[PDB]
Structures are given as structure tokens and as C-alpha cells.
Amino acid sequence: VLSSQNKKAIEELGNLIKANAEAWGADALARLFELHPQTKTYFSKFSGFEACNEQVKKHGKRVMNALADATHHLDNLHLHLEDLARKHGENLLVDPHNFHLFADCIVVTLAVNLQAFTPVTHCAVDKFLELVAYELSSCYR
Amino acid sequence: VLSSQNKKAIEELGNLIKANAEAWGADALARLFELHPQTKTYFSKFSGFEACNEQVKKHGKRVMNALADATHHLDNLHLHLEDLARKHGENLLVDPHNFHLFADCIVVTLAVNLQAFTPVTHCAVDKFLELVAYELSSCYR
Amino acid sequence: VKLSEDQEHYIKGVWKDVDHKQITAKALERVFVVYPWTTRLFSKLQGLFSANDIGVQQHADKVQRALGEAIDDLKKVEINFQNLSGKHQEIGVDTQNFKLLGQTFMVELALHYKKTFRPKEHAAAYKFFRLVAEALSSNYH
Amino acid sequence: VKLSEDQEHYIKGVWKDVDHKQITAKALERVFVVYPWTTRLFSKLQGLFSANDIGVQQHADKVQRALGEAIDDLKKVEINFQNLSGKHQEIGVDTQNFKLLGQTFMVELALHYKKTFRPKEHAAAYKFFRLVAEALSSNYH
Numbered sequence: 001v002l003s004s005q006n007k008k009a010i011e012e013l014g015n016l017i018k019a020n021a022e023a024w025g026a027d028a029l030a031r032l033f034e035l036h037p038q039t040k041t042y043f044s045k046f047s048g049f050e051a052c053n054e055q056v057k058k059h060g061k062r063v064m065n066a067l068a069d070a071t072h073h074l075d076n077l078h079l080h081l082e083d084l085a086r087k088h089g090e091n092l093l094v095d096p097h098n099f100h101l102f103a104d105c106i107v108v109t110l111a112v113n114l115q116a117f118t119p120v121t122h123c124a125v126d127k128f129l130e131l132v133a134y135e136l137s138s139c140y141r
Numbered sequence: 142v143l144s145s146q147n148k149k150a151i152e153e154l155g156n157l158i159k160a161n162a163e164a165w166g167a168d169a170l171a172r173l174f175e176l177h178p179q180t181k182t183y184f185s186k187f188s189g190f191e192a193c194n195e196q197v198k199k200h201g202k203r204v205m206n207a208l209a210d211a212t213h214h215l216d217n218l219h220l221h222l223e224d225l226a227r228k229h230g231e232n233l234l235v236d237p238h239n240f241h242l243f244a245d246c247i248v249v250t251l252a253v254n255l256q257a258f259t260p261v262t263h264c265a266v267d268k269f270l271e272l273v274a275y276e277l278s279s280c281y282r
Numbered sequence: 283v284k285l286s287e288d289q290e291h292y293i294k295g296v297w298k299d300v301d302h303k304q305i306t307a308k309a310l311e312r313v314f315v316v317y318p319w320t321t322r323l324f325s326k327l328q329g330l331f332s333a334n335d336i337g338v339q340q341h342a343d344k345v346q347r348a349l350g351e352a353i354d355d356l357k358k359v360e361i362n363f364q365n366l367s368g369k370h371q372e373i374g375v376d377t378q379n380f381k382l383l384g385q386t387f388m389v390e391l392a393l394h395y396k397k398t399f400r401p402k403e404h405a406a407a408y409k410f411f412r413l414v415a416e417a418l419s420s421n422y423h
Numbered sequence: 424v425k426l427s428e429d430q431e432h433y434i435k436g437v438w439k440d441v442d443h444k445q446i447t448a449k450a451l452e453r454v455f456v457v458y459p460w461t462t463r464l465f466s467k468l469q470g471l472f473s474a475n476d477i478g479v480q481q482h483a484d485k486v487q488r489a490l491g492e493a494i495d496d497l498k499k500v501e502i503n504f505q506n507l508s509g510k511h512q513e514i515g516v517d518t519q520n521f522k523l524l525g526q527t528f529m530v531e532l533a534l535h536y537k538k539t540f541r542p543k544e545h546a547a548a549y550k551f552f553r554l555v556a557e558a559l560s561s562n563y564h
């Protein structure tokens with residue numbers, strides 16, 4: 001699950017993510033494609049991979065909107081993330097390791113945009129993303 | 142959770158593990174200490190790390206007995222592994238990565254001792270061990 | 283990473299003993315089943331992932347030849363694998379995958395040698411595959 | 424791994440700009456909180472894990488000096504870090520930990536440079552810490 005201390009910080013962070021979904025999502029994806037170019041192979045339809053690319057902006061908004069949603073369903077994340085797991089696991093064959101590489105990118109996006117990002121807040125987000133990675137990899141079990 | 146196909150193979154494997162707990166456990170630990178010597182730092186009390194060492198044999202039996210037990214509690218692994226999680230997470234500060242390194246060693250122990258170890262059986266065991274690793278790391282969330 | 287004189291001797295010895303292609307083909311079949319996501323970029327195999335399939339057999343011949351080139355000059359592996367490393371990034375394979383093939387290969391070595399595949403032998407093999415994994419991930423840009 | 428001319432320039436530039444010790448001390452404080460298990464072998468710190476604690480400060484001075492030695496000769500890092508690599512294995516630290524410190528360091532770089540820490544800069548930093556991580560894990564026997 002998630003610790004009480006970690007649960008609280010996440011509940012509130014979702015409000016911020018939802019509001020800046022596109023800008024943050026686009027930023028997160030651009031870092032992923034930049035740091036790990038092999039991940040571009042999953043996005044065969046995309047024409048560009050910069051944060052300004054409309055496709056990247058549209059997809060980034062959807063990722064962040066999904067994350068904000070999940071913060072409101074921490075006690076039953078399996079049921080909530082079930083479809084996305086099927087999408088990523090069964091359909092796209094997304095390598096579980098990629099979820100972690102992406103989580104590390106999202107954390108930097110948050111550090112660059114949040115007013116403050118203390119070790120405690122960073123810790124809560126890391127454990128939350130670790131939970132998401134685990135659920136999105138469920139189709140492999 | 143675990144897939145039906147994967148669940149079945151695991152249920153039966155527990156009977157074999159329980160019966161060969163000491164021999165297999167001792168073998169699994171020896172491989173861990175051999176492949177990753179830095180892991181010996183957790184066992185400050187041990188005098189030797191060979192599979193013939195009585196301490197290694199006593200500890201190996203307990204690990205395997207715990208695993209066999211877990212195969213009979215696949216639908217509520219959190220509740221079953223709770224104490225061991227606290228032991229490994231809160232008390233010993235066992236690096237989550239170590240559980241995976243150890244799982245890879247256990248798989249070889251099984252391949253060397255089982256009559257047959259097909260990719261399908263190997264797959265089920267890998268996902269089962271992945272579940273165990275996740276639960277033993279729960280105190281960090 | 284580097285292997286001691288004893289470890290290098292064992293690895294060359296194993297390579298003279300085993301059937302290069304058959305063991306490699308079985309290692310590939312195992313990686314496809316144990317780690318499902320690995321089949322993603324193997325479109326040329328047209329869904330035929332067994333060791334006895336012609337596609338897998340042809341690919342296995344390529345992989346075993348590369349491993350042999352590594353065993354022949356363990357000191358120049360990183361340099362010799364520069365191209366192949368880049369080749370894998372281009373295709374889109376995650377660096378962690380290299381470790382996974384190393385794992386299924388050791389399981390096949392274990393199934394073949396059984397009880398003679400003791401911790402010392404296992405450690406020599408692991409060290410070899412860790413060197414190969416490093417050389418393939420090194421030239422990722 | 425190796426950095427392009429542009430990436431090496433950025434890294435040397437950052438090292439001239441930031442306060443070596445303070446940023447390193449904050450990176451260590453962050454790793455201890457985000458990844459709790461990392462405090463295990465830091466017994467000399469007697470439970471004081473904050474950036475402003477004398478123990479952390481003294482250790483941070485050692486770590487920053489090593490990083491500076493890497494930045495000074497990016498071509499001979501692996502060779503220069505041979506001893507330090509062995510030193511960490513002896514102590515008992517898991518190789519994956521090196522990547523974790525690299526991550527908290529990039530978060531601190533992000534908090535410092537904010538919006539100027541774009542994907543290109545982030546990629547240069549990641550590539551640098553990946554080279555450092557490799558050099559520290561390379562001499563693990």
C-alpha cells in the first residue's frame with residue numbers, strides 16, 4: 001500500500017498535477033525521449049519528440065490526467081489502473097523497466113516546477129510512482 | 142496477483158520445496174554469497190558461507206520453509222508476509238534489489254534440482270518470487 | 283568487470299563443451315516466455331518463438347557467434363561490441379534486457395550441467411554475462 | 424558510456440557554478456530519506472542524516488572530491504575509480520545504489536537551475552552519473 005505520511009502528500013499533489021497536466025506531461029515525456037531514445041520506438045505515430053510537439057502535448061496531458069486520477073484512488077489502485085495495465089502490458093508490451101525510467105523523469109519535472117520539493121515529498125512521490133509501475137506491469141504476472 | 146496458469150504451477154511446487162528446504166535453501170544462499178559477496182555483510186553472526194556451513198543450512202531451511210508456506214497463501218500474500226517484511230525492511234534495512242538478486246539464485250537452485258524446469262514453470266516461479274520481493278519491500282512504502 | 287584466470291578457463295571450457303546454437307536457441311525461447319515483453323522487437327519471427335523454429339534458429343546462430351567473439355578476446359569485448367551496442371539501441375531494446383538473456387542462459391547451463399554447476403561455476407558464468415551486458419549497454423547514447 | 428563535446432562542456436560548467444559540498448551534502452540527505460536502506464552502512468553518522476550535520480558534511484567533502492576527479496579526466500574515470508569501487512564492495516554496498524545517488528543529485532540540480540534544467544541538460548547530467556555509476560560497479564568482484 002502506501003504509508004499514512006506518504007498518502008497525505010500524494011492526495012494534495014494531485015490537485016496541482018491535474019491543473020498543469022499538459023505542460024508537465026509534455027515536459028516529462030520530452031525528458032524520457034531525450035534520456036532514453038530507445039523509448040521512441042513505442043510511439044510510431046509521433047512526428048516529433050520535443051515538448052512543443054502537439055502530439056507530445058496531447059499524450060503528456062493524458063498521462064498526467066491519469067496520474068492525478070490515481071491519487072484519488074490509492075486504496076484500490078489495482079481496480080483503477082486495470083485498463084491501462086492491459087493497454088501497456090498486453091497490447092504495447094511495455095518493458096516494466098521503462099515505467100521506472102519514466103518515474104525518475106517525472107520526479108525531475110516536479111522538482112523543476114514545484115515551489116518546494118523536500119526529501120519527504122520526493123519520498124512520497126517515489127513510492128506512489130513505484131506503486132503505479134507495479135500495477136501497470138500486472139499483465140505479466 | 143498471479144495468473145491462473147502461474148498459480149497452479151506454484152501451488153504444487155511448494156510440496157517439493159518444503160521437503161528439500163534445507164538442501165535447497167543452503168544451496169540458494171551459497172550462490173547469493175558467491176555471486177554477490179557484499180550480501181555477507183547482513184550476516185554478521187555467520188562464521189562461514191559455504192553450503193555445508195551449519196549456520197547457512199539452518200538459515201537456508203528457514204527461507205525455503207517460508208517460501209513453501211507462501212505458496213499456500215497466494216490470495217493474501219501481504220497479510221502472510223507482513224512480519225518478514227518488518228524484519229527485512231524495518232530491522233535489517235535489506236536493499237530491495239537484493240530480493241531480486243536472490244530470486245535469480247533460487248531459480249538456478251531449482252533448475253539444478255528439479256527433474257524438469259520448462260520456460261512455463263520458470264515463468265510462474267519468477268512471477269511468484271517477484272511478488273515475494275514486492276511484499277518484503279513494503280516497509281519502504 | 284573482469285574474470286579471474288580460473289573463471290576465464292571455465293568459460294572457455296564450457297564453450298568447447300556445449301552446442302553453441304542449441305543452447306543459445308533454448309535461452310532465447312526461455313527469455314521470450316519468462317519475460318514476455320522481450321518479443322516486441324522480434325517481428326521478423328512472425329510469432330514463432332520456439333527453439334525449434336527456423337527464425338529463432340537463424341537468430342540464435344547470430345547471437346552465439348557474437349558470444350564466441352567475446353570469449354575469444356575477453357579484454358576487447360567492450361570495443362568489439364561498440365557497433366552491436368549501437369545496433370540494439372537503434373532497434374529500441376532496453377539495456378536491462380541484456381541481463382535477462384544472461385539469466386535464461388545460466389538456467390540452461392544449470393539444466394545441462396546440473397549438480398556440477400556449483401556456486402563457483404555459476405559465479406564464473408554470471409561474471410561473464412555481466413561483462414557482456416556491460417559491453418552492450420556501454421555504447422548507448 | 425561517453426559524453427559528447429557539448430555534454431562534457433555543460434558538466435564542467437555546472438561544476439564551476441555550484442557549491443560542490445553543499446549540493447553533495449543535500450544529495451546525500453535526499454538519498455537517505457528517499458531510499459531508507461541506504462543509511463545501513465553509515466554507522467559512523469550515528470543517526471544524524473541531515474545536510475547540516477557535521478558527519479554528513481565530512482562525508483560530502485569526500486564524495487565531491489571524487490566527483491571532481493572524475494570531471495577532470497572523464498576518459499580515465501573507470502581506471503581512477505578502481506580502488507574506490509573495490510572499497511564500496513568491501514563495505515557491502517549494492518551496485519544499484521550508485522544510480523540512486525545519481526538520481527537525488529539530478530533532483531538537486533533541478534531545484535537549483537529550475538527551468539534552465541531542460542531535457543538536454545538533464546540528459547548530460549544523467550549520462551555523467553551513468554558513467555560514474557559504471558566506474559563504481561566495474562571493479563566489483
Ligand code: HEM
Pocket residue numbers: 039042043059062063066067084087088092094098099102103132136
Ligand atoms: C507513469 C506510467 C504511465 C502512465 C500513467 C501512462 C498512461 C497512459 C495513458 C493515460 C495512455 C492513454 C491510453 C488510452 O488511450 O486509453 C497511454 C498510452 C500509451 N502509453 Fe503510457 N503511460 C505511462 C507510461 C508509459 C511508458 C513508460 C511507455 C513507454 C516508454 C508508455 C507508452 C504508451 C503508448 C505507446 C501509448 C499509446 C500511444 C498512442 O497510441 O497515442 N506509457 N499511457
Ligand code: HEM
Pocket residue numbers: 180183184200203204207208225228229233235239240243244273277
Ligand atoms: C526470498 C526472500 C527471502 C525470504 C523468504 C527470507 C526469509 C527469511 C526468514 C524466514 C528469516 C527468519 C526470520 C525470523 O527470524 O523470524 C530471515 C532472516 C533474515 N534474512 Fe531473509 N529472506 C529472504 C531474503 C533475504 C535477503 C535477500 C537478505 C539479504 C541479502 C536477507 C537477510 C536476512 C537476515 C540477515 C536475516 C536474519 C539472520 C539471523 O539473525 O540469523 N533475507 N529471512
Ligand code: HEM
Pocket residue numbers: 320321323324325326344345348349366369370373375379380382383384414418
Ligand atoms: C547477450 C546479449 C545479446 C547478444 C550477444 C545479442 C546479439 C545480437 C546480434 C549479433 C544481432 C544481429 C545483429 C545484426 O543484425 O547484424 C542481434 C539482433 C537483435 N537483438 Fe540481440 N543480442 C543480445 C541480447 C538481446 C536482447 C535481450 C534483446 C531484446 C529482447 C535483443 C534484441 C535484438 C533484436 C530485436 C535484434 C534485431 C532483429 C531484427 O533484425 O529484426 N538482443 N542481437
Ligand code: HEM
Pocket residue numbers: 461462464465466467485486489490507510511514516520521523524525555559
Ligand atoms: C556517486 C557515487 C559515489 C561516490 C563518488 C562515492 C564516493 C565515496 C568516497 C570517496 C568514500 C570514502 C572513501 C574512503 O574512505 O577513503 C565513500 C565511502 C563510502 N560510501 Fe560512497 N560513494 C558513492 C556512492 C555511495 C552510495 C550510494 C553508497 C551507499 C548507500 C555509498 C556508501 C559508502 C559508505 C558506507 C562509505 C564508507 C563510510 C565509512 O567509512 O563508514 N557510497 N564513498
